[PDB]
Amino acid sequence: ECDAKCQTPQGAINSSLPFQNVHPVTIGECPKYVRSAKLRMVTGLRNIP
Amino acid sequence: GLFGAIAGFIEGGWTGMVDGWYGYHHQNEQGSGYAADQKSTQNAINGITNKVNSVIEKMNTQFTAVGKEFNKLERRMENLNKKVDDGFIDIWTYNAELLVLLENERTLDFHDSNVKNLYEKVKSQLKNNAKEIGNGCFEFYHKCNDECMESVKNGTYDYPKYSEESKLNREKI
Amino acid sequence: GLFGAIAGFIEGGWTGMVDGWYGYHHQNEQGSGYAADQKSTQNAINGITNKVNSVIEKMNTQFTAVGKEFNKLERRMENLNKKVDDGFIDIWTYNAELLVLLENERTLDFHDSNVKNLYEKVKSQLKNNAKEIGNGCFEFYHKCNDECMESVKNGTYDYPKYSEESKLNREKI
Amino acid sequence: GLFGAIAGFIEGGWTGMVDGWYGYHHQNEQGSGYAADQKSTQNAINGITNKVNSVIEKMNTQFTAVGKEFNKLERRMENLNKKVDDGFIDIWTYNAELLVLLENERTLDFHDSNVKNLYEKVKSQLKNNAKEIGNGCFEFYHKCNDECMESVKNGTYDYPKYSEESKLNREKI
Amino acid sequence: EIVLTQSPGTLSLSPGERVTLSCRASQTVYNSYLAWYQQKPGQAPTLLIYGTSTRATGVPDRFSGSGSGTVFTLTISRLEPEDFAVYFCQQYSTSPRALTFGGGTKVEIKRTVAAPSVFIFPPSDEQLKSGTASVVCLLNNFYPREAKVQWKVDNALQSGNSQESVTEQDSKDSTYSLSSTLTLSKADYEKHKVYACEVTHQGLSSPVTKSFNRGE
Amino acid sequence: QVQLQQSGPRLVKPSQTLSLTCAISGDSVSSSSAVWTWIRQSPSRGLEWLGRTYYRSKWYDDYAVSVQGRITINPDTSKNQISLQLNSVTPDDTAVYYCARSSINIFGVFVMAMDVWGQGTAVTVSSPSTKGPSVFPLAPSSKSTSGGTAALGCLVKDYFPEPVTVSWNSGALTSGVHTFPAVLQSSGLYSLSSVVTVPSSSLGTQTYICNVNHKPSNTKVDKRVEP
Amino acid sequence: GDTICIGYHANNSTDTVDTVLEKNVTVTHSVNLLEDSHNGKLCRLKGIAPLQLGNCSVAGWILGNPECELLISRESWSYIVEKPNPENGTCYPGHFADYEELREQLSSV
Ligand SMILES: *[C@@H]1O[C@H](CO)[C@@H](O)[C@H](O)[C@H]1NC(C)=O
């Protein structure tokens, strides 16, 4: 009885992130699927102790 | 290090300053201890949070679906179906991952600015009352109590008051 | 304010200078009045006009059309038809609006440069004949007529001529 | 010229320096000759090679094909076929050519940095032992042999040693 | 130093009513270093909001922060009975190090007006052997918190020789109780016969007075 | 999860040294992802920060400008605990004392909030004049109980310093109890009363005993209210 | 003499991001744009429930197979689910006209 805005053949997708890599087969308002395995972007500084 | 401060003449990020992203460490008679700067920090958190919120919240996703089954005799269209998905999974993947690096190096050549931005305010506030050590610090040519230190960080540092004492010690050196 | 001039130590855009985007206001015996700088301005108008012309004129649009009607029994293809339109209206919308902000902040961290670019020419032209006021101005240590002022703006300012008079007033201060 | 060095106060690229992208030309008693800088150069070649490698190697191309033949009675789909190709040839062309200019001007406002980055190390190493000529050079106020020159380029230039001789010639001027 | 000030001090809202708590700062607190807390009477506070409008883990969605600069605002969309509590905003500066609070805002749950039951007690004979005589009047289970008591020694209105205090909003019936003491000397107690304790309250149709007589 | 257990209700003579210990469970004390901050709370002066400690490859100590020079917050890597020192305690320092944690990550920036709290410590600093209370019985008049409710009570007069713990029937009696906040009489000695609503059909078939205790002056009185 | 300094952040992080020039650039904190996980269970897409077929497929569901008397139930749905290998379909062989063209029709009701 969960509610989601997206649905894939493996399970839902909850967050409002603009990309997914769970499954290309989506339905509903979904983060457009991308081939990426990692999409981390910097929000801080370079770790230089 | 575009601006030349981050990993530049300031070779070390301070593990002890956890109030913010930019700050000062003072060393005088009354003691020492780090202190972070909010004017510089908060302008950066707010702008970056928004820069993150920017790319997140401009992908407008309509309520649609992908899974289509074709009869074995529409294979050309069944092949056409995949081409329409792969082409997007081509584009939305390329454009995204190139945008990440960009607004990564664009995010690293922003913090380097503000560190450099901060330096040329403190350096343009004393202007000869301290000789620059080069590693990202200053050596005051005069006794500076915590009430004098706190003016350097705020932005209301008094040049005329501590100027007469500066020339007598700068003459010593 | 990346470079730190626009909304930096120059806290105010001059409503009175309408000849250009960058300029100087002088105050001497003979009077005062704004004056805009063409070397800096024109290099910016021309580059930005082209930067605008850049994104405009690289969208090559072929003579085609979109409106397709499908029979009620090709709905899977009628659904496929929309997916091919929405996917573009997905992409060309996302990529555009992210490009706007980019070449917005890229256009704001260009004018900040040239203002800062201008400062470190006038500051590196007098070098001790004036003490920097910090709000984006200079106080000449010597009488400077409009013929002396006009050399500071052009780029042929005379350091040796007004140097002997500088040390006698800088000694006063 | 964002940072203001490339085509700025350094108006000329040295045709004689072919060891690297950045360097120095010294002129003293023992002779003259160019010399390129590896710390600055190599950090740039490696980063740019990777920046090139970046856009190259993020276009993931699946083993697929385009050429589809349709019967004369599926023209609506034959028209649909082209729309799926043109839309990509619309996008992948626009996005690419806009990315080129970007990481062109982003590559020109990187070399301008490092030239400017280099200047404010050599200038912040002597600090009064030489008067800046403005065209991108220095005039040492003291005799500086090739062993003194080589320290300016390395980064271990001795300020206290050649400081006593500096004030006696700076007093002359 | 940054000392906060919240308005109102004490508020009485019915459950479900939209509760708005302003947080005025003596100078600008930056969007990152504002934290809120909800303290129940006796219990230590807990995190409600940090940053400026960032919901703490396990905090429902009725709470929601807002503001910037020197004006911050706490907001409960639907007031709940378990929101009978005092709310503090909290700032933190970094140069110089400062982490202060405000005056706090008690969120009283508004109930109906209740008529107070009055009780009275003469000074005990144990205390009369100590020189003092303390007549003690009392109210119980009334609302709102405001009430007026006037001691009358021999139909003479007293002033300056009586003190009072009221309990917090009870945890079951949401009522207050009031106690008034009449501390006299042994000489001034035996000098008079009748002692009247007059009470005027919103739920009292007329001022109800209970009295006794010394030595009777 | 993360729980903070603190010391019990303490009592310090004037000008002596306060020593409270906070125990952390579930979080390494030397976690580079957590901050340890002490905050005290009086009914008058409200909440006030005292000091903060943390470990980033080394330990640091920052204390609010109100207590600079007589406060220290020492950790203990073995017992997984921290402490607090407050030397030369005045009547100003009689209040509660908490300890904090902070997993309030803002890209590495800390809001300086409290995501983990501790129940609190009753810290009463006694003073020069330590006087015990005289607990008088508030017996009800023979006519104020003819209604549905008998009103019993106990006056707690002439004690210092505050506070005093009041308990009826050693604790079992809890319905209808009311203990008013103490009022500062003109003698500098706090005065307090505590009453209880009980049915009038039990003043002869139920004993009533209010148990009063003033911890700074060892006083513990057991007076029995007989109507 | 007294010394004041200018300096920036550092922490215990081991995250590394990749930039236009250098890769594995260790950063103090980062954020991820990519969603990599699901929950393994279907949900109410659009707010209203989907139609769960189970052992039967779309064919026998609309054909009302005698072994699908358990799912002639639902009067509103946002999407249809079915097993990858449906077991109970058109018990009698034959050609279902415009079958694929109807799974998009009854797709949502
Ligand atoms: C349903 O499928 C099972 C095996 O999957 C089979 O044994 C049974 O006969 C089928 N029923 C019908 C009505 O087709």
mmCIF file of N, CA and C and ligand atoms in Angstrom, chain G residues 55-56 65-68 85-92, ligand 1:
data_model
loop_
_atom_site.group_PDB
_atom_site.id
_atom_site.type_symbol
_atom_site.label_atom_id
_atom_site.label_comp_id
_atom_site.label_asym_id
_atom_site.label_seq_id
_atom_site.Cartn_x
_atom_site.Cartn_y
_atom_site.Cartn_z
ATOM 1 N N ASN G 55 -1.962 -15.045 -11.847
ATOM 2 C CA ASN G 55 -1.794 -16.221 -12.696
ATOM 3 C C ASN G 55 -2.381 -16.015 -14.087
ATOM 4 N N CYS G 56 -3.421 -15.196 -14.207
ATOM 5 C CA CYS G 56 -4.074 -14.972 -15.486
ATOM 6 C C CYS G 56 -3.470 -13.759 -16.195
ATOM 7 N N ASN G 65 -11.927 -16.338 -17.815
ATOM 8 C CA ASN G 65 -11.613 -17.757 -17.783
ATOM 9 C C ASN G 65 -12.191 -18.397 -16.521
ATOM 10 N N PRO G 66 -12.654 -19.650 -16.609
ATOM 11 C CA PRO G 66 -13.256 -20.299 -15.428
ATOM 12 C C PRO G 66 -12.313 -20.433 -14.241
ATOM 13 N N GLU G 67 -11.002 -20.293 -14.442
ATOM 14 C CA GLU G 67 -10.027 -20.331 -13.358
ATOM 15 C C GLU G 67 -9.561 -18.938 -12.937
ATOM 16 N N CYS G 68 -10.218 -17.887 -13.421
ATOM 17 C CA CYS G 68 -9.974 -16.517 -12.985
ATOM 18 C C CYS G 68 -11.247 -15.911 -12.394
ATOM 19 N N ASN G 85 5.454 -14.922 -17.405
ATOM 20 C CA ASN G 85 5.005 -16.106 -18.140
ATOM 21 C C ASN G 85 3.590 -16.452 -17.697
ATOM 22 N N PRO G 86 2.578 -15.816 -18.284
ATOM 23 C CA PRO G 86 1.195 -16.093 -17.871
ATOM 24 C C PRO G 86 0.814 -17.540 -18.141
ATOM 25 N N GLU G 87 0.208 -18.170 -17.137
ATOM 26 C CA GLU G 87 -0.127 -19.589 -17.164
ATOM 27 C C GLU G 87 -1.544 -19.865 -17.643
ATOM 28 N N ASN G 88 -2.514 -19.059 -17.226
ATOM 29 C CA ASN G 88 -3.920 -19.266 -17.565
ATOM 30 C C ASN G 88 -4.374 -18.142 -18.492
ATOM 31 N N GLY G 89 -4.432 -18.432 -19.790
ATOM 32 C CA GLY G 89 -4.855 -17.451 -20.771
ATOM 33 C C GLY G 89 -6.091 -17.869 -21.541
ATOM 34 N N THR G 90 -5.979 -17.936 -22.865
ATOM 35 C CA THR G 90 -7.072 -18.384 -23.726
ATOM 36 C C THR G 90 -7.057 -19.908 -23.753
ATOM 37 N N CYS G 91 -7.808 -20.524 -22.829
ATOM 38 C CA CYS G 91 -7.767 -21.977 -22.666
ATOM 39 C C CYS G 91 -8.025 -22.702 -23.976
ATOM 40 N N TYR G 92 -8.842 -22.118 -24.847
ATOM 41 C CA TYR G 92 -9.085 -22.692 -26.152
ATOM 42 C C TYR G 92 -8.217 -21.985 -27.178
HETATM 43 C C1 LIG H 1 -4.017 -22.988 -15.586
HETATM 44 O O1 LIG H 1 -2.612 -23.291 -15.591
HETATM 45 C C2 LIG H 1 -2.271 -24.522 -14.931
HETATM 46 C C3 LIG H 1 -0.765 -24.646 -14.994
HETATM 47 O O2 LIG H 1 -0.140 -23.371 -15.065
HETATM 48 C C4 LIG H 1 -3.001 -25.700 -15.584
HETATM 49 O O3 LIG H 1 -2.720 -26.904 -14.877
HETATM 50 C C5 LIG H 1 -4.503 -25.439 -15.613
HETATM 51 O O4 LIG H 1 -5.175 -26.482 -16.312
HETATM 52 C C6 LIG H 1 -4.782 -24.103 -16.291
HETATM 53 N N1 LIG H 1 -6.209 -23.823 -16.324
HETATM 54 C C7 LIG H 1 -6.829 -23.366 -17.417
HETATM 55 C C8 LIG H 1 -8.300 -23.124 -17.284
HETATM 56 O O5 LIG H 1 -6.228 -23.162 -18.469
#
